[PDB]
Amino acid sequence: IVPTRELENVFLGRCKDYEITRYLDILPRVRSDCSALWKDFFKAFSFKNPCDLDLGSYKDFFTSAQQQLPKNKVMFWSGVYDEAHDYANTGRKYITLEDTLPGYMLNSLVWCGQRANPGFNEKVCPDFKTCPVQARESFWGMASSSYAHSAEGEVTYMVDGSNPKVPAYRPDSFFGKYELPNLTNKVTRVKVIVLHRLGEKIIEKCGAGSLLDLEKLVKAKHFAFDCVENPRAVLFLLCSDNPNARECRLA
Amino acid sequence: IVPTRELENVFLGRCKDYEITRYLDILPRVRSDCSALWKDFFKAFSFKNPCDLDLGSYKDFFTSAQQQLPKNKVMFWSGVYDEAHDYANTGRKYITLEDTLPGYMLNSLVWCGQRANPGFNEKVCPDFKTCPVQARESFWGMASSSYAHSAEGEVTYMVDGSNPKVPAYRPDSFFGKYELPNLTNKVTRVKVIVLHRLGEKIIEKCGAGSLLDLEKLVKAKHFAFDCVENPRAVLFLLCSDNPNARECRLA
Numbered sequence: 097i098v099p100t101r102e103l104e105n106v107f108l109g110r111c112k113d114y115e116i117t118r119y120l121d122i123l124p125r126v127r128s129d130c131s132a133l134w135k136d137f138f139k140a141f142s143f144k145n146p147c148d149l150d151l152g153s154y155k156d157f158f159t160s161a162q163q164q165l166p167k168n169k170v171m172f173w174s175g176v177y178d179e180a181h182d183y184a185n186t187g188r189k190y191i192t193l194e195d196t197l198p199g200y201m202l203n204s205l206v207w208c209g210q211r212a213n214p215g216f217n218e219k220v221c222p223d224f225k226t227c228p229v230q231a232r233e234s235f236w237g238m239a240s241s242s243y244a245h246s247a248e249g250e251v252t253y254m255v256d257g258s259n260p261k262v263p264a265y266r267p268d269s270f271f272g273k274y275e276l277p278n279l280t281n282k283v284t285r286v287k288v289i290v291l292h293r294l295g296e297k298i299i300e301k302c303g304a305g306s307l308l309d310l311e312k313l314v315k316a317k318h319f320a321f322d323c324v325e326n327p328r329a330v331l332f333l334l335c336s337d338n339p340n341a342r343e344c345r346l347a
Numbered sequence: 348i349v350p351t352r353e354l355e356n357v358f359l360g361r362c363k364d365y366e367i368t369r370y371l372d373i374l375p376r377v378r379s380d381c382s383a384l385w386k387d388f389f390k391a392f393s394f395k396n397p398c399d400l401d402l403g404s405y406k407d408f409f410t411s412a413q414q415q416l417p418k419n420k421v422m423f424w425s426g427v428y429d430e431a432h433d434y435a436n437t438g439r440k441y442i443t444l445e446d447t448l449p450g451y452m453l454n455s456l457v458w459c460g461q462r463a464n465p466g467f468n469e470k471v472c473p474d475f476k477t478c479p480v481q482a483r484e485s486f487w488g489m490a491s492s493s494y495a496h497s498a499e500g501e502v503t504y505m506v507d508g509s510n511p512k513v514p515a516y517r518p519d520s521f522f523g524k525y526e527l528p529n530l531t532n533k534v535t536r537v538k539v540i541v542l543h544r545l546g547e548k549i550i551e552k553c554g555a556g557s558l559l560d561l562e563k564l565v566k567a568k569h570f571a572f573d574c575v576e577n578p579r580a581v582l583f584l585l586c587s588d589n590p591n592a593r594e595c596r597l598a
């Protein structure tokens with residue numbers, strides 16, 4: 097896998113762009129300035145071996161970059177990146193990790209450390225599978241944890257209910273590993289949105305399978321729980337990219 | 348109106364972010380580097396009075412920032428910013444001015460010159476209405492011109508057909524002023540999408556009113572012409588934000 101060019105600049109650029117202009121009305125500005133955020137982010141993996149990281153490596157960074165989240169707009173998703181973000185509509189309906197400062201900054205970027213100066217590899221980065229999980233998921237895992245930890249009020253989770261190989265809810269999806277377990281008592285409810293991809297055999301349904309397990313698990317953490325399959329607002333979104341779909345026939 | 352803070356940085360940050368990571372697959376990278384683009388952009392209004400600009404002021408900037416545009420997918424819009432961009436889907440379906448380098452960089456930013464050093468005002472900018480049009484629309488007007496001039500093949504135009512005070516097509520909308528008149532012979536057709544806001548009296552219709560005028564006007568410039576009212580892909584998008592709407596009733 098090839099690392100992102102001019103990581104420093106891309107980071108700082110994205111950071112500044114965010115600071116001054118991005119979710120001015122949806123999310124709070126962070127207190128630390130970009131150079132400070134860069135240092136916290138760099139020390140986390142610089143001059144260490146690419147696989148030399150754990151959930152704590154970016155702790156300082158995430159502490160500096162964590163913004164308070166608006167009650168009720170936090171959204172989590174699993175295996176439905178495009179659908180979840182379209183529905184979230186760039187912080188308008190729900191915010192996603194990708195909409196927060198840390199997420200927006202590192203979204204899609206590729207980087208890794210090396211022990212030799214300059215401290216990070218600019219030619220190549222190890223493959224996912226090469227490193228132990230705690231290093232492999234050190235950044236996005238922590239990001240997800242910090243994010244989830246900050247959720248207030250109702251929280252929303254969109255999952256793929258049409259994937260025969262992957263249950264809607266899984267104890268070891270980033271959600272199951274870092275998001276759900278880190279929801280604080282500030283969280284009120286967990287509303288689930290099950291997505292049934294168009295023209296696809298339905299695999300998961302509310303009150304059944306992993307959704308049924310999640311429900312117990314959620315009420316266990318003492319939160320209210322909701323669940324809906326293809327709510328119209330969302331269905332229509334799916335229909336847009338595939339109008340002919342049988343499930344979109346107009347009255 | 349208050350100017351954008353750290354204009355320089357925001358501009359350069361946005362610029363770099365774009366360069367390295369933004370529409371890698373949809374749009375070509377520009378040849379000039381960010382510092383060069385900044386100089387062309389700054390000279391255009393720096394050390395002049397806020398109202399001291401004309402269609403030519405940013406000519407150099409736009410020349411350097413103009414990317415070649417994908418055949419058949421350039422989209423233009425009028426009074427339907429949100430609907431047009433959602434449908435365009437960030438360059439996935441159609442690209443819009445805001446998806447191009449110049450647009451992405453200056454989108455939503457506020458700036459103006461002043462004659463005293465540093466050359467631009469950081470406290471306040473004059474109101475739209477205060478300056479002569481050629482200065483007032485110097486930047487976005489030029490941007491629109493340059494953009495339109497680069498369109499090839501089929502071109503798409505989305506308009507509001509539900510606005511009693513503003514006809515779908517107007518000789519003096521930015522489209523009518525800078526986009527339509529600048530379409531080159533590289534343009535094949537002009538497909539129009541009339542938007543009929545949900546639960547709103549329909550005002551304009553294809554083959555009628557301003558749409559009828561546009562049609563003549565288009566065939567005049569020797570382009571083929573299409574027109575559709577609330578095509579399903581788009582209708583569904585409207586329905587997403589308002590499911591109860593009568594026009595969204597499911598079969």
Ligand SMILES: NC(=O)c1cccnc1
Nearest residue numbers: 193194202203204205236
């Ligand atoms: N940048 C990414 O690839 C990514 C993937 C999944 C969740 N958050 C970020």
Ligand SMILES: NC(=O)c1cccnc1
Nearest residue numbers: 205206207221232235236
């Ligand atoms: N190699 C990578 O792209 C990467 C991304 C995010 C966190 N850790 C590693």
Ligand SMILES: NC(=O)c1cccnc1
Nearest residue numbers: 445450453454455487521
């Ligand atoms: N995107 C914009 O800045 C813009 C400005 C004026 C008219 N239409 C769009």
Ligand SMILES: NC(=O)c1cccnc1
Nearest residue numbers: 456457458483484486487
């Ligand atoms: N930044 C601005 O105030 C501005 C005004 C008019 C056209 N382009 C930019």
